[PDB]
Design a protein around this nucleic acid. Structure first.
Ligand SMILES: Nc1ncnc2c1ncn2[C@@H]1O[C@H](COP(=O)(O)OP(=O)(O)O)[C@@H](O)[C@H]1O
Ligand code: BEF
Ligand SMILES: [Mg+2]
Lengths: 520, 41, 51
DNA sequence: GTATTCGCTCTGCTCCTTCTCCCATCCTCTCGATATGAGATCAACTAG
RNA sequence: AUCGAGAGGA
DNA sequence: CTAGTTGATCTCATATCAGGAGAAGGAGCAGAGCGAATAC
């Protein structure tokens, strides 16, 4: 057995399975428990965070550490598609735990409130969804839970969302977030997460804005003055030091050599609008609606969504072999057809993502048009069948392509059976695309994976790619290093409506550090 | 720019003189000065 | 007490633009500041900011 | 042991200040200003 | 249509 | 019984001077009246 500082023992057979970084994470989690503080397991997608949590909880119950003897009644809030995944991992890794699902699928077949009461009074693990936490906040918080692990806790990123306010009602100090991307659009998200795990460190949201968000963000713009860049550097370093003890973020670069993952590629194809697609795009950017948008009269959403649809496929004006969604009318669909042909002749398995459900239906129709054997999972599929479906695609290699929406197909599922991954449509949030592309390159991937991220050249999609590159740079400025190069590719203004198709310290080290920070 | 002396029957002043002084070229609006007489050492 | 719609009718205009009544606009103001104040008193807010 | 005051309170009296209210009825005309989809939940089916 | 304004009538 | 399809509904997320009159309160002074308090 592995013996930690005070009284925490994790069983030897369980400990041996874990990798070096995973047991380092268990150590860190128990140091947080000693401090009675929350944390973010920021390890990227696929590095293993369900296993670290399961091992830490198993050692906590096993160790009988001193209301609660060992482990109390814990609640795990996760996306609906991964609830049964958590159940399976708990059963395989620590079968002694009672692990009930609070969901319509569930296993209880009686009043839910009875299930919450039973798990609370039995010191079991209640896995629930974020929607249920919002809905059952009256009952979920009356029972003095011990641990409130939030899997994919970046769903709490909006400080004013009802789910966030619900999840911030738990009285316990032991609040954990599992999310390999705990910053997706700006630093408000980081503040929301750190308000959840440890309400005090980053102060009130106004104060956090004034001290960190405006300095750090405003120093990343292309026109930033050098003094402002240095101020942003100072603020980013301060924030990194502030959030260091409670963020544990391991990359797949410092762990890849110690984990034997196969090679990865992250190509970004710039697809070409077809003549008809280009015509529709040019007609729309020349229309009066976009003119009204640029004048501030109407909301930008109509034009933005229309351009995204046009780049996806001209489903605005639905033009035999001229049915709705015909592949040859969209350039990205032509590229996807070529890629699918090549990969099928190479005997490989492909993971085809989409932001839009309608574009997913169009891709599904195009796949039946070919002889490809597909398998689809979007928000409409019943949750109870989602983990089965994933297992199916992970089990038999007869299934060639796995269609997905990035909101359901991403976000914590394991699809290591897939070999190639193609992100058909960019999103405004970089993190959606990141999780979608890490669905394949995970622990258990025995083959070389590559990611093909399709963008239409000179369209709104390239501008979205630029916006999310800027967001990723802003995130890296505070997650990996503060020396981040300024985003210079664009100014990120409201001219994304244009078509531009190509062709003890002894008071001296401390004083020295104060001088260093102030001279910046 | 003319001094006008009036007397309000119901007031704390027996007599109050005013001038709405205004520089001839319209640089500014007229500024009024009052020189009053406190009502009835 | 929010009054009903008949106390504050939304009169339609020569086109389709539905003009709301002064009471409706004022209830909009009360609602926005009430919601905003609610989120401040629920969260940590400066006593003078709450005031 | 009673004068005699005497400090302290209890109204109470003018007065000045604030503030709030009101200011005929009815009728005609002109003129200017004044989002969208994905995911989740649930409930009705809609059939096996 | 509403609001306001103005000009009028007895 | 019992899973799969269909609609409604909610959440969440994507950027960039030429009034006047009266009533209610508070203010400061004035005194009256009674307890104690020296003191002849
Ligand atoms: N120590 C381990 N030994 C064997 N398999 C592991 C280990 N850690 C993680 N895995 C596997 O890697 C996959 C990804 O882990 P998981 O925690 O589910 O994803 P994430 O950490 O990205 O949330 C899981 O299917 C899990 O079974
Ligand atoms: F971070 Be995910 F669960 F892979
Ligand atoms: Mg996970």
């Amino acid at each position: 057995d592995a013996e930690f500082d005070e009284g925490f023992k994790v069983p030897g057979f369980l400990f041996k399975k874990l990798f070096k970084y995973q047991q380092t994470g268990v150590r860190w989690l128990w140091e947080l428990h000693c401090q009675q503080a929350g944390g973010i397991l920021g390890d990227e997608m696929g590095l293993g965070k369900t296993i670290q949590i399961i091992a830490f909880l198993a050692g906590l119950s096993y160790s009988k550490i001193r209301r609660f003897e060992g482990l109390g009644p814990t609640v795990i809030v996760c996306p609906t598609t991964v609830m049964h995944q958590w159940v399976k991992e708990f059963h395989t890794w620590w079968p002694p735990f009672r692990v009930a699902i609070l969901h319509e699928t569930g296993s209880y077949t009686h009043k839910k409130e009875k299930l919450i009461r039973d798990v609370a009074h039995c010191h079991g693990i209640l896995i629930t969804s974020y929607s249920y936490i919002r809905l059952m906040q009256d009952d979920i918080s009356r029972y003095d839970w011990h641990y409130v692990i939030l899997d994919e806790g970046h769903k709490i990123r909006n400080p004013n969302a009802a789910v966030t306010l619900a999840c911030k009602q738990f009285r316990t100090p032991h609040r954990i977030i599992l999310s390999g991307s705990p910053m997706q659009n700006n630093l408000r998200e980081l503040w929301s997460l750190f308000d959840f795990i440890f309400p005090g460190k980053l102060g009130t949201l106004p104060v956090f804005m004034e001290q960190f968000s405006v300095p750090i963000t405003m120093g990343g713009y292309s026109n930033a003055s050098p003094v402002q860049v240095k101020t942003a550097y100072k603020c980013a370093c301060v924030l990194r030091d502030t959030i260091n003890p409670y963020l544990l973020r391991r990359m797949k670069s410092d762990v890849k050599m110690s984990l034997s993952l196969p090679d990865k590629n992250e190509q970004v194809l710039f697809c070409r609008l077809t003549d008809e697609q280009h015509k529709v795009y040019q007609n729309f950017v020349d229309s009066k609606e976009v003119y009204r948008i640029l004048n501030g009269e109407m909301q930008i959403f109509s034009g933005l969504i229309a351009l995204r649809k046009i780049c996806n496929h001209p489903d605005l004006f639905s033009g035999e072999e001229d049915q709705f969604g015909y592949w040859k009318r969209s350039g990205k669909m032509i590229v996807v057809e070529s890629l699918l042909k090549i990969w099928h002749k190479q005997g490989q398995r492909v993971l085809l993502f989409s932001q839009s459900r309608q574009m997913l239906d169009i891709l599904e129709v195009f796949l039946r048009a070919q002889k490809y054997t597909y398998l689809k999972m979007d928000g409409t599929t019943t949750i109870a069948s989602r983990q089965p479906l994933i297992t199916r695609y992970n089990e038999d290699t007869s299934i060639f392509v796995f269609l997905l929406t990035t909101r359901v197909g991403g976000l914590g599922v394991n699809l290591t059976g897939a070999n190639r991954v193609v992100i058909y449509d960019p999103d405004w949030n970089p993190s959606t695309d990141t999780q979608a592309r890490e669905r394949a390159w995970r622990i258990g991937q025995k083959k070389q994976v590559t990611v093909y991220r399709l963008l239409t050249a000179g369209t709104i999609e390239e501008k979205i790619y630029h916006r999310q590159i800027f967001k990723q740079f802003l995130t890296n400025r505070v997650l990996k290093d503060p020396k981040q190069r300024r985003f210079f590719k664009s100014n990120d203004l409201y001219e994304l409506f244009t078509l531009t198709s190509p062709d003890p310290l002894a008071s001296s080290s401390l004083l020295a550090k104060m001088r260093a920070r102030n001279h910046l | 720019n003319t001094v006008y002396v009036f007397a309000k029957k119901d007031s704390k002043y027996a007599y109050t003189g005013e001038c709405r002084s205004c520089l001839e070229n319209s640089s500014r609006p007229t500024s009024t000065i009052w020189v009053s007489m406190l009502a009835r050492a | 007490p929010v009054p009903p719609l008949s106390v504050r009718p939304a009169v339609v205009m020569q086109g389709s633009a539905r003009n709301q009544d002064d009471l409706t606009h004022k209830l909009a103001d009360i609602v926005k500041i009430n919601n905003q104040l609610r989120r401040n008193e629920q969260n940590g807010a400066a006593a003078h900011v709450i005031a």
